[PDB]
Ligand binder design. Structure first.
Ligand SMILES: CC1=C(CCOP(=O)(O)OP(=O)(O)O)SCN1Cc1cnc(C)nc1N
Ligand SMILES: CC1=C(CCOP(=O)(O)OP(=O)(O)O)SCN1Cc1cnc(C)nc1N
Ligand SMILES: O=C(CO)[C@@H](O)[C@H](O)[C@H](O)COP(=O)(O)O
Ligand SMILES: O=C(CO)[C@@H](O)[C@H](O)[C@H](O)COP(=O)(O)O
Ligand SMILES: [Ca+2]
Ligand SMILES: [Ca+2]
Lengths: 675, 675
């Protein structure tokens, strides 16, 4: 049949791509081709408009199987061709060894690190539910799309997928349909060696619906029926168990050897001849397959055309909601939204930056509907919920509604991070955030790095940033954390010192379109600084206190800026004149002009950094570094600062030693380099 | 009764400790005191010998509840007193806000970061099973101890505990008995808001046995009976559901407000009077409670005395095993074990450091019985299993035996990391390791940081260290990872360049008693270096190529040392004389004498670092840094190196620019500082 021919075409494109690269993973593509064919035939999508907001989304969570995804995209006429398949895994190609949303048309997210994609799918589905609750009206199903996810055994072993699956079941996300490639083979061999749990029983315990397809190597009728069944269960996410043979058709089918290496050439020949293809030919695309797939594309394009007319009619019937929706689909924030950001003066009271963050959120959430977010069971500590908002919950619970804006993630940092990526991936200008303690952002490093690589504008509201948290002690006090994330490409790491800087940090985080943000916020109160403003802090680094005859400049962040200002006064009594630079975001600063940066960190003056955590990275901006390169302590925070000499006198002593160390030396800016 | 009085004493000590600190968590201690009393009465332990190898172990995974643990330790006469309880959460005390194994007698592990302790308990139980299988003989139950773990709802939400619980069920760890504090309250309020899964059904799906105690606020008879029942089920770990009221007895019992803040003074008064205590008194310890607890201690000490005689008789009956066991309990490796480490010369073939690591393990595992380890489903890629070893599995599976040495962790990096901590915590000189790709060590950051804080000598075998892995692409290629872990206190991060350096890295990792190791290893082949040795590499950094008239020194690690040596030859043709330093472990280097370090990185010469990942940290050792501060690419590895100019010519160009940049300048060692 043409369907059988399509499945063979998919299988053979994937195997031929792996063969051409002499690298990659043929097994899961061979096993999952029937399911991929069946699912894409049920999906609504436009290969010529990858951003249609009412498309069904597909996520390949088992990203190593990407030769399968690329084959589907090529067959359906996305902006990806057989010539791109021939360049699978080759430097600079559009067919990298794991899918990248920035590079691959039709890749919704970046997968490859196991466990992530299913969580991303939870986030896409969460966003779709929130979006539909916000915009749909009687006779106006603006959003009614599904989220389809393929996943393997490795994904099911990773704890992040358990977190997201527990939460998705709690949230009754009925438009999520996941498919488990139940092939009983991982890299170490049989799943009997390490993975003998009853997966189906576990998913039932989370509140998922289950459909089992016992012969998923061939039974596309049953796979299609499973999708229909899943669509009838509107209050549970569904897991479809696809019992497959890894490498189906290969001489080496059902073995670990077909997971992750190219097939032998003789194996590929017998595959082709068993399926009616020419064993002398590679990258074959039968025209009948193209015709069949084109018919589905044409039907989908008519569906999108009708959706566009529905949207036009919606804008007439619901003028304000329609304009809001249009603005969001154009990727634009509300005009002058930032006028809602709070502004402070030096006469205002001292406030913890966690509380300043609460106040910002309270002002901007009512003004910017595309902001949603939550906390990982730290709502009353992170201060992440605006008063007067309702939680995102299924209405059946009585605890919220899908129109809600605040997500109770539970104690699930890693899944929160990956769900945030999925919410961003949904689109519609979502600007979403997640709160935890800064030290526990590290639990989510797998997802955070993918936010950076995927260029998603997500925001971590990361409170309790340092030893300033006090009594909870060294298991809670960050040391390495900002160095880790600052060393990751494309992460804005804001550590605001005061009210104006906190508003600048949020301005950056909400305006972002391609850069994730981490906001490192304090438990303890900090004073409003003389010299701070949103304008200056928006440059990432700025001169807080200018001293034309400076003997030293102190560069600091966060809670240490006020410390530096106090040290300047001690130094004045020692006959040393200091300037102060505040560096609330190193990435934003780095992006400023060379001349701007040199105006902040000039030649001809020693520069000392002060920040109560690792000194890594700080030599970019300073000659000497005063930091904390050991673990913390359990005690009242001011006593810990005193112990480690993060006091005005301790900073002054080190500043004076710095001045003395550079006596008789020629000093150039830390910004200078040889290459 | 005296048991009732003991429970009240525990509750009130915990509440009074929180009150004195005006900080901490009274709720779970109040709810769990009956269970703590019952479990400690069943446990075998010696407060005067915390390291007795056949003790039962207790782990408080819900570490915020540590006022409960400290109260138990004080009542049982560990080296912790009521005066220490009065200093709960105070700077420098023995009663920090979360338990620390380095600081607190009777704290087996460091908990506080949720999810970790249950995984640590899995590791303690895994080690006990392996240890018993290795040493027990007929009439010689050298090891027969249990592992008791308390955990809360937050622990059950964290994905790491799902990973470890799936694995523990697979491994049939019948001496693990965990207790869930089923109080339905977390920080964000009711568990109905985010945690509605059927926990018991999930644990059954993992192959755990379940006991439910419906009235755990009072029914210590049922808690004791649950332990007896769990001990009869020898092939399944057991979860005991303790249905409790958070803050039991408080006016605010059953509310989130009692989770994490001190009780009101009037509340504490009514607690005391309801339980027969003096509301005017704090830190009361009724002598009858002390007497009761002392009787159990005395009985346990007689049990240990008998164990010591059993051990003496074992050494007579089994002389070789007995001497091995004695050596391990003394914390000593086999005499001259390191003579098994492979040694290479520059005439030997190029080898990937992953393969060199395989070869080391193959030589040392047969010589050092206390080495065990595994991989997170990457055994044939990490090369972590010695040929001729058997896997650690329950014999009932037919797939291994508990005497086995190789653990199939599955795709569970985070739990692997926390299980490794538990294996180390067991003691008996275990030197245990875990393999994954370096980029996915990041999935386990929560546990890795705790290895460092807890001072456990665990080892990560972290292969595929860079863009040198090639085609899998940027989702797999580390950039930030070594900076992250190097910035963490107390982590040795070895990046060996060749065979001799790889042997030095293992010498360090296996000899370690207080410092975790990460071994960053290559996919690709590297040459054996002229000038390397175990002796020199054991210093962490050393002069590989000495040049007395150097214009520049190039400092490098791993795969970039050979690159630096090739660049030296290009530079010679440009009239520039270079030296080369190899820096296989920055931590070990830092610990050398000032004079040694200055012999490697002298004054008076520019120093350029070369390492194909983040430049963070490198200014400690260099004036200029050539690194990779962007994400990688999917392609053949040599083409990626060429793209980023990590070539002999690219390094030489930057070296020449460095020499030119310092012309006419006075240069001092990067090791110098102002303070
Ligand atoms: C173990 C591992 C894989 C086995 C999958 O086994 P699986 O899901 O059962 O896939 P299969 O049916 O055999 O093709 S892929 C690559 N990876 C290394 C790998 C490890 N950890 C993380 C976080 N991401 C990864 N990418
Ligand atoms: C959420 C959070 C807690 C709630 C526990 O809730 P729970 O287990 O149900 O405890 P309970 O019965 O209410 O006392 S503690 C502190 N913590 C912050 C916290 C967050 N993430 C990590 C990894 N470790 C933590 N320590
Ligand atoms: O991490 C934990 C305990 O392991 C939480 O219970 C925190 O102790 C608490 O949220 C801190 O509260 P505040 O810092 O907001 O007072
Ligand atoms: O991470 C994955 C895929 O996401 C594994 O399948 C690796 O691709 C494989 O283990 C690399 O193998 P070698 O580098 O040992 O050839
Ligand atoms: Ca599989
Ligand atoms: Ca609880």
């Amino acid at each position: 049949s043409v369907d059988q021919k399509a499945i063979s075409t998919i299988r053979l494109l994937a195997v031929d791509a792996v063969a051409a690269a002499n690298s990659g993973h043929p097994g899961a593509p061979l096993g999952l081709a029937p399911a991929a064919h069946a699912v894409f035939k049920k999906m609504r999508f436009n290969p010529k408009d990858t951003k249609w907001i009412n498309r069904d989304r597909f996520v390949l969570s088992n990203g190593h199987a990407c030769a399968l995804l690329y084959s589907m995209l090529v067959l359906y006429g996305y902006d990806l061709t057989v010539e791109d398949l021939k360049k699978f895994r080759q430097l600079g190609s559009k067919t990298p060894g794991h899918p990248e949303n920035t590079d691959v048309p039709g890749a919704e997210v970046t997968t490859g690190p196991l466990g992530q994609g299913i969580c991303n799918g939870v986030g896409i589905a969460l966003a779709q539910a929130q979006f539909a609750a916000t915009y749909n009206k009687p006779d106006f199903p603006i959003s009614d799309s599904y989220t389809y996810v393929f996943l393997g055994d490795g994904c099911l072993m990773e704890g992040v997928s358990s977190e997201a699956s527990s939460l998705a079941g709690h949230l009754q996300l009925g438009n999520l349909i996941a498919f488990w490639d139940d092939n009983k083979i991982s890299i170490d061999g049989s799943t009997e060696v390490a993975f003998t749990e009853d997966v189906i029983a576990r998913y039932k315990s989370y509140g998922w619906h289950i459909v089992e397809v016992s012969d998923a190597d061939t039974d596309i009728t049953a796979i299609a029926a499973a999708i229909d069944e899943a669509k009838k269960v509107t209050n549970k996410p569904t897991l479809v168990r696809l019992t497959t043979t890894i490498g189906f058709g290969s001489l080496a089918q059902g073995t670990h050897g077909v997971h992750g290496a190219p097939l032998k050439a003789d194996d590929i020949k017998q595959l082709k001849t068993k399926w009616g293809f020419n064993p002398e030919e590679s990258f074959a695309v039968p025209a009948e397959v193209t015709a069949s797939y084109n018919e589905h594309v044409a039907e989908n394009q008519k569906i999108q055309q009708q959706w566009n007319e529905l949207f036009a009619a919606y804008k007439q019937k619901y003028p304000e909601l329609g304009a809001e929706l249009q603005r969001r689909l154009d990727g634009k924030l509300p005009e002058n939204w930032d006028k809602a950001l709070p502004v402070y003066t030096p006469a205002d009271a001292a406030v913890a930056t966690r509380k300043l963050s609460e106040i910002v959120l309270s002002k901007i959430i009512p003004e910017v509907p595309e902001i949603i977010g939550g906390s990982a069971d730290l709502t009353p500590s992170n201060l992440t919920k605006a008063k007067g908002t309702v939680d995102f919950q299924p209405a059946a619970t009585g605890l919220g509604d899908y129109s809600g804006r605040y997500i109770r993630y539970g104690v699930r940092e890693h899944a929160m991070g990956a769900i945030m990526n999925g919410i961003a991936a949904f689109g519609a200008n979502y600007k979403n955030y997640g709160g935890t303690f800064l030290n526990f952002v590290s639990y989510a490093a797998g997802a955070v790095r993918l936010s950076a690589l995927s260029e998603f504008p997500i925001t971590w509201v990361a409170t309790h940033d340092s030893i300033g948290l006090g009594e909870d002690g060294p298991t809670h006090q960050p040391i390495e954390t900002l160095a880790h994330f600052r060393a990751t490409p494309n992460i804005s790491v804001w550590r605001p010192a005061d009210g104006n800087e906190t508003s600048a940090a949020y301005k950056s985080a909400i305006e972002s379109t391609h850069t994730p943000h981490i906001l490192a916020l304090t438990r303890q109160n900090l004073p409003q600084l003389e010299g701070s403003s949103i304008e200056k802090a928006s440059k990432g680094g700025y001169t807080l206190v200018q001293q034309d005859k400076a003997d030293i400049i102190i560069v600091a962040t966060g809670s240490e800026v006020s410390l530096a200002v106090d040290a300047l006064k001690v130094l004045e009594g020692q006959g040393i004149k200091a300037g102060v630079v505040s560096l609330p975001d190193q990435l934003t600063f780095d992006k400023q002009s060379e001349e701007y940066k040199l105006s902040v960190l000039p030649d001809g003056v020693p520069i000392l950094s002060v920040e109560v955590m690792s000194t890594f990275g700080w030599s970019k901006y300073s000659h000497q570094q005063f930091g904390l390169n050991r673990f913390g302590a359990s005690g009242k925070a001011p006593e810990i600062f005193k112990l480690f000499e993060f006091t005005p006198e301790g900073v002054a002593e080190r500043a004076a030693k710095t001045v003395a160390f550079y006596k008789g030396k020629d000093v150039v800016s830390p910004l200078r380099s040889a290459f």
